Design a binder for this molecule. Structure first.
Ligand SMILES: [Zn+2]
Ligand SMILES: [Zn+2]
Ligand SMILES: [Zn+2]
Length: 82
């Protein structure tokens, strides 16, 4: 897979139509806190309650990975791995 890391800053990537927005009940500050396909690390959320929403004309936004206000726990962005 190809990767473009956002290290030392937030992701902020705008979801493309059709993509999942991931939320985690445990990690999210609230229900508007979301991660993109590039960032969501399944390892961070094994014992967690995760839901996806799907990007449409009316459901969109930007990825909160790297924005510390959005998360209760340290996230390990998927893009940073190898
Ligand atoms: Zn992202
Ligand atoms: Zn990320
Ligand atoms: Zn989580």
């Amino acid at each position: 897979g190809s990767v473009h890391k956002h290290t030392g800053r937030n992701c902020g990537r705008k979801f493309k139509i059709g993509e999942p927005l991931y939320r985690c009940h445990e990690c999210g500050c609230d229900d508007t806190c979301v991660l993109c396909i590039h960032c969501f690390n399944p390892k961070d959320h094994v014992n967690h309650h995760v839901c996806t929403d799907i990007c449409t004309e009316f459901t969109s936004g930007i990825c909160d990975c790297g924005d510390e206000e959005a998360w209760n726990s340290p996230l390990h962005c998927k893009a940073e791995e190898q």
